[PDB]
Design a protein around this ligand. Structure first.
Ligand SMILES: COc1ccc(C(C)=O)c(O)c1[C@H]1C[C@H]1NC(=S)Nc1ccc(C#N)cn1
Lengths: 405, 557
């Protein structure tokens, strides 16, 4: 089959990213895999005449024993964007977010059957390091479509549409969305009818040589995380003070959170412990206040042109809160994540959020992670399971944990 | 020879073209030399005669060798090295002795005339053209080009080690029980075989290399471990660093202090307890390299301990893949941490030290955490796996800190080891306001154009103090106003501030800072028995805050 010519964003050059050191077991795993992918002609050893590099890691399947290879094309994707986004983009169905059930299938192997424009293969160079640098390092490059690369779906878009054609024609009320390595299939059918429909789809796929998982999302059961206000029996000065502080915050966001009435309440210079009475306009202010805070900020709309940002706060006790927004304090969605290691949970939450993000908006957000850069980089892969990797910057959470958002 | 190996295709940077530098007039003695030389190379295949159809020329020189015995052919490649494509890197890290398996037999074979025994890409030779001038530029001169790897060219090291790999690949495969490490010209071959079965294997390799154009020693193998490599002295049994020797001068120049600090840092990989905080403190502040810096008592004592440590030779052992890895971390001075990594009680594999600060305001629980993250990373690289730690911290102290900190923290398998000092949080911050405890509504202001602020406070018991401040930021008047509420205040106290900034710094339980103030506030905090901090929107007019805010901003604001 003829190949598609690919060009980088003119002005930008190929990826030159360092390879984060790996542990023994992951190096052994990687050499086995790459050894086989070579015999099969998917990748080819390369010389030093290739100045490019992209990091690679070894992760686990859906909790199985098999080690899977995971190249990190974050960079390359960026130098390619124009291509995989404008030239040959892939429409994102607004119906997916509404579905009662959405199943995700890893149609990754699918790309290994399509050759990559020879003039582009040098930009997919990666290195399998060695321990204690006792070796130069094993280099390779891709001959076929690689799995991390967002370019792979775009190209394969043609072949994907045919394969799915029959199924779609016969099942018009099922949304099929494709996003970098995965297939999102949603429907409003009863679970079993859905689950069945999914099997049927594997069969079509199977005929064009394509395995399958499993893994069900229920979008329509995704709701907001209101900004919680207390509702205590007693009352101290301190409590009402915090009550005012938070309310004050929720004013630059959520227009109409009148706090004036509740403020000026029991003032002067009292002890913090001193318990206090109640008010009538107060009871009513809280009422309307929360009433507003319960529902999304009026005036905030998703702008396709701008980046999505996800911020996470460690609430303690295994609780994690997050907000996705494009303009600070203009939450498009907020949420929570609950339920062993601090890093493990965080990585878990990052994947969950990224997933919801892909379904609702068709793009991954950039994370502001509440952790030490070094620690994250040293351990994330240890629990990571998705086939994609979002952009992330390590932030330093302000005492903003107070207001859950 | 010239290796029969295939060639690595190379090219100039995209829009650029070959080099065309003008050959500067050289003298007769120099002109004669280069001819006697090039003729010799040409006779071996290293270079070839070409004509003036090649628009590319590269400047040639010649300088005399030791005491002026023979000349040398220097080829200023700068211009070409600038138009040549980029390559991968020859080495991304350097093996650490501690990561070497213990070996019985080890010999070091060094390849002779490396770059000259490897073919250059035919389509690239045309760029490696240079010319030998005629006395006072009359005759056109002799033009030559390269058939092998030029000495000072950008791609020689890359293409060489690259080539050397392929050549070795077969031999390695047939001898899976033989480790070969390539570092430039030299080749390190070690095994568990006997000097007999070993030197036999060596030849087999020398031969293998010869079948590829690689001439290697015979009796000048240099194998003779000991081994001085990259600043280390290796023995088949153990390893250690090249011998250190401390100057012992009467005066120290910034230069002297530096060499010294460099030797010690290098010595700290295996000599536990090395300390250079007091000495490094002396290099602070722009200072000439020849300026004499007087040693302060502390540094004077520090240089002492180090001398003490370096006297009796200390050695490191090698890595046993079977046994586990254990790392212990001790807290030396303030902010300083030393650690040792071993597999068998006290037979250190390697030693180290962490002393980084990491921003102003921080505590031992946080510093200890970072040191673990370092040692973890370091351990991965060298040995491919993370060690179990032994930390001078209570399972409690840790467990209580991690759960009450906003940042996410992890920490590999560890155990508490009672090796004093012990890490502890020097104070907590009550979560509930203290009942029947004087509440201090602190605040501060500061005229931005003047710098005149009044940091004060007002309590629920009437008291109200207000001090004036000069040359201060709006932040200091908020951090100072807290210092006040802490001074003339009892053992228990509730403090209400409108300074997120201050709230932030303090809520993180720092036990050391770079702010002269912050340290003071810390002293107080360690003295109190119950402190409660809270926040409220600054100058929003709230019960209490307003009251203070008033007399704080009353003029001079
Ligand atoms: C990673 O590979 C290197 C890096 C450096 C050296 C050096 C400096 O000799 C080296 O021999 C090697 C590899 C041959 C193998 N050596 C191994 S594993 N162990 C030992 C043990 C003692 C000595 C002794 N004496 C040298 N090597």
């Amino acid at each position: 089959i003829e190949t598609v010519p690919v060009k980088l964003k003119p002005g930008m050059d190929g990826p030159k990213v360092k390879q984060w050191p790996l542990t023994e077991e992951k190096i052994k795993a990687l050499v086995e895999i790459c050894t086989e992918m070579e015999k099969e002609g998917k990748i080819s050893k390369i010389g030093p005449e290739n100045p490019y590099n992209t990091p690679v890691f070894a992760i686990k399947k859906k909790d199985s024993t098999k080690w899977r290879k995971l190249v990190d094309f974050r960079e390359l994707n960026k130098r390619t964007q124009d291509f995989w986004e404008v030239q040959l983009g892939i429409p994102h169905p607004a119906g997916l977010k509404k579905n009662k059930s959405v199943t995700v299938l890893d149609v990754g192997d699918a790309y290994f059957s399509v050759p990559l424009d020879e003039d582009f293969r040098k930009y997919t160079a990666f290195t399998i390091p060695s321990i204690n640098n006792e070796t130069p390092g094993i280099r390779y490059q891709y001959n076929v479509l690689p799995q991390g690369w967002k370019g792979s779906p775009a190209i394969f878009q043609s072949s994907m549409t045919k394969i799915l054609e029959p199924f779609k024609k016969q099942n018009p009320d099922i949304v099929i969305y494709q996003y970098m390595d995965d297939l999102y299939v949603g429907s409003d059918l009863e679970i079993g009818q859905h689950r069945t429909k999914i099997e049927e789809l594997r069969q079509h796929l199977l005929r064009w040589g394509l395995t399958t998982p499993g893994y069900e999302l229920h979008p329509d059961k995704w709701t907001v995380q209101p900004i919680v206000l207390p509702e205590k029996d007693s009352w101290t000065v301190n409590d009402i003070q915090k009550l005012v502080g938070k309310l004050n915050w929720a004013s630059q966001i959520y227009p109409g959170i009148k706090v004036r009435q509740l403020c000026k309440l029991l003032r002067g210079t009292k002890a913090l412990t001193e318990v206090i009475p109640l008010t009538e306009e107060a009871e009513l202010e809280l009422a309307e206040n929360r009433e507003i805070l319960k529902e999304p900020v009026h005036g905030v709309y998703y702008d396709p042109s701008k980046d999505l940002i996800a911020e996470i706060q460690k609430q303690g006790q295994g609780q994690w809160t997050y907000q996705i927004y494009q303009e600070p304090f203009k939450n498009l969605k907020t949420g929570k994540y609950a339920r062993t290691n601090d890093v493990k949970q965080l990585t878990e939450a990052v994947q969950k959020i990224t997933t919801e993000s892909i379904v609702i908006w068709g793009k991954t957000p950039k994370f502001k992670l509440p952790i030490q850069k070094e620690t994250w980089e040293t351990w994330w892969t240890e629990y990571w399971q998705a086939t994609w990797i979002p952009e992330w910057e390590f932030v330093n959470t302000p005492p903003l944990v107070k207001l859950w958002y | 020879p010239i290796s029969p190996i295939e060639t690595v295709p190379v090219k100039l940077k995209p829009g650029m073209d070959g080099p065309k530098v003008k050959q500067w007039p050289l003298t007769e003695e120099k002109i004669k030399a280069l001819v006697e030389i090039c003729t010799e190379m040409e006779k071996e295949g290293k270079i070839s005669k070409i004509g003036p159809e090649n628009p590319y020329n590269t400047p040639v020189f010649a300088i005399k060798k030791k005491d002026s015995t023979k000349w040398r052919k220097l080829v200023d490649f700068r211009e070409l090295n600038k138009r040549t494509q980029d390559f991968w890197e020859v080495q991304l890290g350097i093996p650490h002795p501690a990561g070497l398996k213990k070996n019985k037999s080890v010999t070091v074979l060094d390849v002779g005339d490396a770059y000259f025994s490897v073919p250059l890409d035919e389509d690239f030779r045309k760029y490696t053209a240079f010319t030998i001038p005629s006395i006072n530029n009359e005759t056109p001169g002799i033009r030559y080009q390269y058939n092998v790897l030029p000495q000072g060219w950008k791609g020689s090291p890359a293409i060489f080690q690259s080539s050397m790999t392929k050549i070795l690949e077969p031999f390695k495969k047939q001898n899976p029980d033989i480790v070969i490490y390539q570092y430039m010209d030299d080749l390190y071959v070690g095994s568990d075989l006997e000097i007999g079965q070993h030197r036999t294997k060596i030849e087999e390799l020398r031969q293998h290399l010869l079948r590829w154009g690689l001439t290697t020693p015979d009796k000048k193998h240099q194998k003779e471990p000991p081994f001085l490599w990259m600043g280390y002295e290796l023995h088949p049994d153990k390893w250690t660093v090249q011998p250190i020797v401390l100057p012992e001068k009467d005066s120290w120049t910034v230069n002297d202090i530096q060499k010294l600090v460099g030797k010690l840092n290098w010595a700290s990989q295996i000599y536990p307890g090395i300390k250079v905080r007091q000495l490094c403190k002396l290099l602070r502040g722009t200072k000439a390299l020849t300026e004499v810096i007087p040693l302060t008592e502390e540094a004077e004592l520090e240089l002492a301990e180090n001398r003490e440590i370096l006297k009796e030779p200390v050695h490191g052992v090698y890595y046993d893949p079977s046994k586990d890895l254990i790392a212990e971390i001790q807290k030396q001075g303030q902010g300083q941490w030393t650690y040792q990594i071993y597999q068998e009680p006290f037979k250190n594999l390697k030693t180290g030290k962490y002393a980084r600060m990491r921003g102003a305001h921080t505590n031992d629980v946080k510093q200890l955490t970072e040191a673990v993250q370092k040692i973890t990373t370091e351990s991965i690289v060298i040995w491919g796996k993370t060690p179990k730690f032994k930390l001078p911290i209570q399972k409690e102290t840790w467990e209580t800190w991690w759960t009450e900190y906003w940042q996410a923290t992890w920490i590999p398998e560890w155990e508490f080891v009672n090796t004093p000092p012990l890490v502890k949080l020097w104070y907590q911050l009550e979560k509930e306001p203290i009942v029947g405890a004087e509440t201090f509504y602190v605040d501060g202001a500061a005229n931005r154009e003047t710098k005149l602020g009044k940091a004060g406070y007002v309590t629920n018991k009437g008291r109200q103090k207000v001090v004036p401040l000069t040359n201060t930021t709006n932040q200091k008047t908020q951090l100072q106003a807290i210092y006040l509420a802490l001074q003339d205040s009892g053992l228990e106290v509730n403090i209400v501030t409108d300074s997120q900034y201050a709230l932030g710094i303090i809520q993180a339980q720092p036990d050391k800072s770079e702010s002269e103030l912050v340290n003071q506030i810390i002293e107080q905090l360690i003295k109190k028995e119950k402190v409660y901090l809270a926040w409220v929107p600054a100058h929003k007019g709230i019960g209490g805050n307003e009251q203070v805010d008033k007399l704080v901003s009353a003029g001079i604001r």
